[PDB]
Structure 1
Amino acid sequence: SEFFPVPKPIKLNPHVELEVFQCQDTIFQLSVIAPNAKLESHQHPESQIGMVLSGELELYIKDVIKPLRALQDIHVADANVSHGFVNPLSEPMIGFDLKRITSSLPSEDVVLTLSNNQDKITHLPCQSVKGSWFEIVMMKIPSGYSIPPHQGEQEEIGFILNGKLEIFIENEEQCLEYGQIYYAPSKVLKKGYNSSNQDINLIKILILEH
């Protein structure tokens, strides 16, 4: 559905497998990059951001090489900026990316790092960073916690890394596990509930432009 999109599985080359989700004008993908993969640099008109979830990655961008750490660093490739990658480990890299034709002014950094903060709506501790066209928030949803009803001005895409989370968007409800996402367009009512006995790690991306 629009709010709980079904991914399309793609194999991009012998090294890269993707689960591709459409979120109106944003594409969200979960990636699996093979052990020791070299990914040739490419460019495209879509701006791109992403993070490693498991493993490690090296970003090749603007004639420098930047390491990317799991659940910490976000790579940022503005429109038509040439970017490539190496997986420096003999383990697969599991990650995600978002791609979107952006209107915003250029990003000042090719790598951003999450830092400790507080989630506005819930007042729960989180780690976050804000970029030129996006904000990424990672946070633990405690066992039993109810994410209160909220209508955001900004589009939001989210997913979890472990456990099972109940998510309601506008007029539709699903239990989410890792491998699925939710998409909440601007102004839709969203709420959620961790009915499991474990703390759930949630990542959300707010799209700052329309």
Structure 2
Amino acid sequence: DMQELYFPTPKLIEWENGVRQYSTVRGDTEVLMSYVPPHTNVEPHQHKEVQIGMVVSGELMMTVGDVTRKMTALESAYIAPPHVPHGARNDTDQEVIAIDIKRLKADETYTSPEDYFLDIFKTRDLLPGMEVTFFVEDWVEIMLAKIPGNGGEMPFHKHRNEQIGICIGGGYDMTVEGCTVEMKFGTAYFCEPREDHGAINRSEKESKSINIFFPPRYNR
């Protein structure tokens, strides 16, 4: 009944310059997957919401404040604090696929590295065979996860931490509070604090996801 809560139906945003974005929202948080065409500029802006982002595919020139970093897929993240100007350019011959999370909570303090970009904090197995990679700031933890094929599983559990995520490769069955969805590329899920969730990958190919914790769960 409430599947729309945990797995929001995305809206498509189609710009005139060719950028396409898929918007999923639950309450105070929005997830956007963006496809930016070759040699295309994304005009700078600013807003009261904090913004965290990462490249999923391709290479993107990302600008936050005075800083522009060439972002390689899945190897860095950025945080644009509230009202900090930010924009981007796909300066390559290839499409960029990027992810960004926009958010505003009254009790959160949106710190960031002084030059805005986060590098890999640590890579390691979360469960035997399940490799994860962390990017860590005070109030948020990004965790890349690979769920092995042929039965790879994240057992059901709950935690104080809010947890939001998006599938970025392969497929898997995701369950939140008794609602099971077949995740595919771009599918987003939203877990409020203490909401039951789990996952299994029954396919042959491993499945990749980006999972985000407020506040950090593993590296505090």
Same fold (TM over 0.5): yes
After superposition, the C-alpha distances for 1:74-111 in whole angstroms (9 at most, x for unaligned) are: 11100000111111102111111000114215212411
Whole-Å separation in 2 of the counterparts to 1:23 and 1:130? 23
Aligned to 2:187: 180
Q: Aligned pair in 2 of structure 1 residues 140, 105: CA closer, same or farther (>3 Å)?
A: closer
Gaps of 5+ in 2: none
Determine if contact 1:59/1:68 at 8 Å carries over to the other structure.
yes
RMSD of aligned residue pairs (Cα, Å): 1.8
Matches within 5 A, 1:46-125: 46-102=49-105, 103-109=108-114, 110-118=116-124, 122=127, 124-125=130-131
The more displaced of 67-76 and 160-169 is: 160-169
In structure 2, C-alpha distance between the alignment counterparts of 1:119 and 1:46, rounded to whole Å: 32
**Aligned partner of 1:171: which letter?**
G
> Partners of 1:139 and 1:10 in 2: how far apart?
27
For residue 139 of structure 1, report the CA deviation from its aligned partner: 1.9
Alignment of 1:145-164 (within 5 A): 145-164=152-171
1:193 to 174, 195, 200: 200
**Aligned counterpart, 1:169:** 176
- Of 42, 46, 56, the match for 2:45: 42
Give the TM-score normalised by structure 2: 0.88
1:128 corresponding residue in structure 2: 134
What whole-Å deviation, never above 9, does each CA across 1:124-166 have from its counterpart, x for those lacking one? 3311111233111112111212211110211111122222211
Distance 2:75 2:19 in 1: 22
How many percent of aligned residue pairs carry the same amino acid? 29
Per the alignment, residue 25 of structure 2 pairs with 22
Matched residues in 2 for 1:4 and 1:61: separation? 30
**Contact map agreement 2:51 2:102 (CA 8 A) in 1:** yes
CA apart distance, 1:67: 1.0
The answer to whether the Cα contact below 8 Å between 2:121 and 2:136 also exists between their aligned partners in 1 is no
Contact 1:68/1:75, CA 8 A, preserved across alignment: no
Judge conservation of contact 2:175–2:199 (CA < 8 Å) in 1: yes
Whole-Å separation in 1 of the counterparts to 2:95 and 2:23: 18
Note the C-alpha offset of 1:174. Answer: 1.3
Give the TM-score normalised by the residue count of structure 1: 0.92
Asked if the contact 1:116–1:125 (Cα under 8 Å) also holds between the matched residues in 2, the reply is: no
Change in 2 beyond 3 A, CA 1:161/1:58 = same
Q: State the alpha-carbon separation in 1 of the partners of residues 188 and 163 from structure 2.
A: 10
The answer to whether the Cα contact below 8 Å between 2:50 and 2:110 also exists between their aligned partners in 1 is: no
- How many pairs are equivalent? 208
